[PDB]
Design a protein around this ligand. Structure first.
Ligand SMILES: OC[C@H]1O[C@@](CO)(O[C@H]2O[C@H](CO)[C@@H](O)[C@H](O)[C@H]2O)[C@@H](O)[C@@H]1O
Ligand code: IUM
Ligand SMILES: [Hg+2]
Lengths: 68, 68
């Protein structure tokens, strides 16, 4: 049950909805989205590599904020 | 040379920029993105399915409008 944190440059509610859709499509994840602070937290067994690649499918700029 | 027309639910400048990035990655395309009218036109040799799948993976709501 590793807990990862990512930076995603979402600018409106529509941006947040799209992040939700790609994560729902992958499955096996428990996530939380903080729009104002451009942050996404994900608890999952999927590798960090897979989570990073999935988020990048949105076309948004993504970086890693680490574990915890 | 074929010109495909799509409807894409973009709600801010960031949404439009994200669409342009996934298309740039695919390559072999010439496009025009209209934010206020929520439309994207694409001139390319890639198949209709390849283009649709590329737009769908962004997590945004997409639908095909026509071809010429
Ligand atoms: O944000 C896109 C889109 O949302 C609308 C309602 O569909 O406006 C809402 O969201 C804005 C955030 O960017 C708020 O500032 C606004 O007050 C709220 O109604 C559209 O107006 C906008 O195009
Ligand atoms: O991008 U224009 O017409
Ligand atoms: Hg947006």
């Amino acid at each position: 049950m590793p807990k990862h944190e990512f930076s995603v440059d979402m600018t409106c509610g529509g941006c947040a909805e799209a992040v939700s859709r790609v994560l729902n499509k992958l499955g096996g994840v428990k996530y939380d989205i903080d729009l104002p602070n451009k942050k996404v937290c994900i608890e999952s067994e999927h590798s960090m590599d897979t989570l990073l690649a999935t988020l990048k499918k949105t076309g948004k700029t993504v970086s890693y904020l680490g574990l915890e």
